[PDB]
């Protein structure tokens, strides 16, 4: 005997995103294993969380990786990239580039800076995170007064830097840069604290390698979709 | 007494998670 | 209803309160409204990893200034308001100020003081009440569309307009605006009277409640205090006319974080 | 196997206020947490017993908020305004602004007088509400005869009054005059019983200033939805 | 995930006696008490057992409440009204506007006679039910062979009858008219078996007065609405 | 026995509060 049902508004549609199955077709059906094939990665998280290269510009728009210094002052220096997980830089970075396929984030980001330089040398930087509310700061004296790091160039090649989620909303957007609207925040700087030093036989100029990461605190949620591109 | 306008006997097929909105308090590489 | 009492403001209506290293004092209270029911812990913001400037003696006290002068004049509903943070905002702000526009963010609740001391053939009656999403501005702005002065501290009073359609603004009409405000509900606030009759000063207390347990200082204003009046100072010939109203707050507990290098900019 | 179904004759209708839900579309999504906001009202009801302010008028219509009074003889006085959760006086109160997103009311409602005046002041009145039967009372005299309570003007600056729900109907309609019907009731009013008195110093005249609640009695229950304005 | 059904014939129809519920609209809606008001009834049945009047006619088609009688020989007598719950008589009656409502009846019927002459008066009445099969009696002789009770006119003011179910069929039709066609059954007659007698200084001519119901074994079963009428 | 014309096995999805009419007998501010 027939169980009556109430036809629903809806009725005919479909949803993209609806969590739930639909019909087979092709049964009882089994897959060729696997077994032997290590190397699945189940989340992605885990993926962003691996530098991967953040491209410092010079005339020809032939940006290159490498924050390259010397012999002496800045400037208001060595670079500037902002903290806009959207940015020049940080995108086509994986952290970033996974980013985006998310429209929220959370947690403390990470700067890694490898130096390159002939090992006769020695150097000494200060590094910033510097958090809107007044300007881009315009001297290392402006910019100090934030979270930083004095890095003594020695053995130890590479320094891990990781600037902080200092955000009002627990949450932040990935980055739609409808503009510049309020939520995003960050600018990080670094300027040499004493020159970059080094005796006769070697070089002035020294290039140091950039590599960008999501921390131990880095969450995006809110899977979306982007922004068609096409590259060059 | 419940929810608000939601009375069903049946309440809810997909999964809380899934109808409204969770809800909340404040691999290697190898060397 | 409170202890036995007057022509002279007595026992049960003498209060008074310390903070910092500033007391205070009032010989005519009739309470203290701690509005909503819950202060404000120095519950660090959960959305930082900043491990801010706490527990600091010197801006958890009493700042005091004048707001402005009541008199016979004056109309029902007429309104002057108070935004805070923005107003304990610098120079007249002491070091709540300072370490204020060093950081980001801040995290505070108020304790709000207004005194208005008059004489026992004076009518009148104050309607003092703390509301956060509010309004300020004083103006419709120059030449280019969107809206005068918000951080201003409104310099003289104004106009209860026979009709919200809260000050809409770009040359128009027809309807009202998401700045309304029904001065007739005006009493849903947490609020407190001030009767020269019963009153000679106003006690009121309020937590933290914005969008974020933090907010940023330079673009919102929380809470506006409203110091406007809803039964007129009638006096006779004789008596002091001059009613002088004065205000003093207190930060309760504010919890600063996200440090960096002294803002810049107020006209 | 397919279970079968008799389909029900409405089959596709959409139901405003269906109780039951519908499909999601994005799952799995946490949302930002509160935590640190107090002040959440779940009952609108606690809402409607906090005054906000009834305008009493004067030619401009230009209503103000004081009954307003003095040195002697009413009149058929210093005011009345009837009970009928529709007035011209209620409405715009909350209690009054949310009985009416409501068809029906029950319980006592209280209203409640603060005087104004000078401190070396004193007056006395007679307060009432006098149920439909016969008519408006024209004379203290006449008015009297109904729940009252003379009002001693001291030290005690407020009086609360409560106007009962003397009702045959368990309930009233919030109000919606398409004519005066029948269920509804009221008229309160106010006169000196003795006038408003003064010494020398001190003003004639003095502002008492109105403002209606909804007891610990009160009752609004059937939503709906008024009657669009746009005000002013 | 969506389980398969099979979609039944009917799929779009509306049933008007249809044994189950739909969809709300005004839910967690609370009605308003009754308490204090007796007499509900929640039988139809215990209703058409209440007599309420078989109109009796007199040229000008005046029909009116008596069977009336005086001092001596009938006729064929006093009255005559068959049973065929669809009558001319009992039809304005409840029982008879109660039986209609529905499609068949069973059980007994009971007919109350209530005498209204003088008290000084004195008569003696023979009557009876004579079913179906020969024809309707011409002589009281003739009618006595049924089931009668000869009723002593005294103190005691009113008699009760009861016509039974002299039925073949365990029910019968409540009445439609479409000929008259071998279910209905019944006349119950009455005439004096001893003249009406009277003394000096009392009426000749006394009126009667006549009332339906149906006993302590009356069934009426089959929802039905008849017959549009709009009266006179 | 049962309510009227109404005899379905599965007797109201929604809650009774939800079909017929319930039936019926007769946070601060602070200081």
Known sequence: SPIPVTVREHKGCFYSTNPDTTVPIYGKTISTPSDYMCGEFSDLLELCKLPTFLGNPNTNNK?????????????????????????????????????????????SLNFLFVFTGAAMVKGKFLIAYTPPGAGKPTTRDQAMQSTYAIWDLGLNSSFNFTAPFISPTHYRQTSYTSPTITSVDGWVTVWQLTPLTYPSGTPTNSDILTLVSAGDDFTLRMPISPTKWVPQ | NESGNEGVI?????????????????????? | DQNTEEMENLSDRVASDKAGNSATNTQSTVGRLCGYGKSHHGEHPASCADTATDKVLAAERYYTIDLASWTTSQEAFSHIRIPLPHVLAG?????????????????????????????????????????????????????????????????????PQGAPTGYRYDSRTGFFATNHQNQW???????????????????????????APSSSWTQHANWTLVVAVLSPLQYATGSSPDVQITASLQPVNPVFNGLRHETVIAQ
Chains 1, 4, 5 share one sequence.
Not at chain 2, 10 to 31: G, M, P, T
């Open chain 1, 63 to 107: 940006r290159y990786p490498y924050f390259s210094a010397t012999n002496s002052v800045p400037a208001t220096s060595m670079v500037d990239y902002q903290v806009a997980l959207s940015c020049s830089c940080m995108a086509n970075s994986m952290l970033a580039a996974v980013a985006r396929n998310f429209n929220q984030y959370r947690g």
């Open chain 2, 10 to 31: 049946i309440n809810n097929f997909y999964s809380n998670q899934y109808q409204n909105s969770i809800d909340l308090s404040a691999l290697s590489n190898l060397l």
């Open chain 3, 91 to 159: 120079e007249d702000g002491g070091v709540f100020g300072a370490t204020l526009r060093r950081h980001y963010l801040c995290k505070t609740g108020w304790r709000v003081q207004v005194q208005c001391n008059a004489s026992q053939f004076h009518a009148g009656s104050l309607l003092v009440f703390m509301a956060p999403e509010f309004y300020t501005g004083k103006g419709t702005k120059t030449g280019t569309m969107e809206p005068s002065d918000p951080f201003t501290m409104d310099t003289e009073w104004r106009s």
């Open chain 3, 185 to 211: 509900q005006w009493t849903v606030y947490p609020h407190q009277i001030l009767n020269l009759r019963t009153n000679t000063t106003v006690d009121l207390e309020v937590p933290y409640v914005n969008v």
